């Protein structure tokens, strides 16, 4: 998503579902290859501590002035007609400068946007229609004329453009916390293995304290730990070494 070959338009904003895997966000915060990074509700580096159900990434390219419209409680041509956001957005926003990547001498015609719509969009709505936009009481009949214009319009992404008009590969990282189980989590840490010493234990699904030593017990390939007659732990299988 962040390093896609060819991004989609704004009215044709792509969405990629991510789940059932680990997501290392700390590399992004320390990448230093982004013009902006803004996370709503949660810190960007704290994302590695939380777990979610589903995570999407809405990608599109816009001009610099339209970047502020990409937020909850905004208004604009993109905030209304091409990609509208809700009022309770709590995902994240990452901005990459594409003036040297997606810019074209004489404007970039591969990317367009609905500069005209009959009304406003909904949160995370997409409208890929090519209906001629009517503004007056006359009928367009599919063609243009008085108050009848093709709504989609090309972009002026150019080396001549300024900071507020050059392209910007935008990626809005959506999050979901449903009753369904958590499927995406941050990366966990670890350390070396000590023995013959009173230490604390924090295993994958088990904690406690005690001294740890090798043993001759024969665990099964799927067994993680064991308990005694009194339902008390007395053994454990190391998760990184069988």
């Amino acid at each position: 998503v962040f390093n896609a070959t060819r991004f989609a338009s704004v009215y044709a904003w792509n969405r990629k579902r991510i789940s059932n895997c680990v997501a290392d966000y700390s590399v992004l915060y320390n990448s230093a290859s982004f013009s902006t990074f803004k996370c709503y509700g949660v810190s960007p580096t704290k994302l590695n501590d939380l777990c979610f159900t589903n995570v999407y990434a809405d990608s599109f390219v816009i001009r610099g002035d339209e970047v502020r419209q990409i937020a909850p409680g905004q208004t604009g041509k993109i905030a209304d007609y091409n990609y509208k956001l809700p009022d309770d957005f709590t995902g994240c926003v990452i901005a990459w400068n594409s003036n040297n990547l997606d810019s074209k001498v004489g404007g970039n015609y591969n990317y367009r946007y609905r500069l005209f719509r009959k009304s406003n969009l909904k949160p995370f709505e997409r409208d890929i229609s090519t209906e001629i936009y009517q503004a007056g009481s006359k009928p367009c009949n599919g063609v243009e004329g008085f108050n009848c214009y093709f709504p989609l319009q090309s972009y002026g992404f150019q080396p001549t453009n300024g900071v507020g008009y050059q392209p910007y590969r935008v990626v809005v990282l959506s999050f979901e916390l449903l009753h369904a189980p958590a499927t995406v989590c941050g990366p966990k840490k670890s350390t070396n293995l000590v023995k013959n010493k009173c230490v604390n234990f924090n295993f994958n699904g088990l904690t406690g304290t005690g001294v740890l030593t090798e043993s001759n017990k024969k665990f099964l390939p799927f067994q993680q730990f064991g308990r005694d007659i009194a339902d008390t732990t007395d053994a454990v299988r190391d998760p990184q070494t069988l």
Epitope: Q134, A135, G136, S137, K138, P139, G145, F146, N147, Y149
Partner: antibody, heavy 120, light 108 residues
Framework: EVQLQQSGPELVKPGASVKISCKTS????????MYWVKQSHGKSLEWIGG????????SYNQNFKGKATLTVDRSSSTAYMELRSLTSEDSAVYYC?????????????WGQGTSVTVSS | DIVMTQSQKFMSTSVGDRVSVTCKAS??????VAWYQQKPGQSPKALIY???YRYSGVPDRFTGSGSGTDFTLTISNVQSEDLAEYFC?????????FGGGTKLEIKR
């Protein structure tokens, strides 16, 4: 209260040019389309053209192509009609209008009218 | 362009009488026509749009019917404020072609 106020009556010599204004207040001037018409004395009505303030698209009548041009001033919400090559046939009143398509209408909502007479 | 013909130009109906104003079109205009009301000297105001709907502030006695070719602006209970100039417009193809006009009169 939506209100359209036009200019006063102008006495003009043949061959000259005038500018008829129609100030707008009470609504969003950018979206709604503004028309211009002409009513001669004792005869039927006739339509001249219409201008769109958000874009600038114009579509004049074919009998008024080299007769009238339209300019919109968004800095003060004032439209203008400039008549050229006047003759004795332009002894008429001129109204401004307002389209109503984003309100489930076909409305014109005519203004006041400027009586423009020609004589030497 | 479209030639909107009105016939006749004069009509005479007393108060409390039913009057019908008609005007024809040349080509297939469809549904989108209009009707207006012009007091002598004053500015015209809108009465009926799309031959089935009134405006905000006009009386409910101004009804309209007809489609395609014939259009009729029928008034049930006329008054002294009904005496005006009535025109008909089209909204089908640019440029807009207004009608001829019909003036009302009191019978004597």
């Amino acid at each position: 209260e939506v209100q359209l106020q036009q200019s006063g009556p102008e006495l003009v010599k043949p061959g000259a040019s005038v500018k008829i204004s129609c100030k707008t207040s009470g609504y969003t001037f950018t979206e709604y389309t503004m028309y211009w018409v002409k009513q001669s004395h004792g005869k039927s009505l006739e339509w001249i053209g219409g201008i769109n303030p958000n874009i600038g698209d114009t579509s004049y009548n074919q009998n008024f192509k080299g007769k009238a041009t339209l300019t919109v001033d968004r800095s003060s919400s004032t439209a203008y009609m400039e008549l050229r090559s006047l003759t004795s046939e332009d002894s008429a009143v001129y109204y401004c209008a307002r389209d109503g398509y984003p309100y489930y209408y076909a409305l014109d909502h005519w203004g006041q009218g400027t009586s423009v007479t020609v004589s030497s | 362009d479209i030639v909107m013909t009105q016939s006749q130009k004069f009509m005479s109906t007393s108060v409390g009488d039913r009057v019908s104003v008609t005007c024809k079109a040349s080509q297939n205009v469809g549904t989108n026509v209009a009707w207006y009301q012009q007091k002598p000297g004053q500015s015209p105001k809108a009465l009926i749009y799309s031959t089935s709907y009134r405006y905000s502030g006009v009386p409910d006695r101004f009804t309209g019917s007809g489609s395609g070719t014939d259009f009729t602006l029928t008034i049930s209970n006329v008054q002294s404020e009904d005496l005006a100039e009535y025109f008909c417009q089209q909204y089908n193809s640019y440029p807009y072609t207004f009608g001829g006009g019909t003036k009302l009169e009191i019978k004597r």
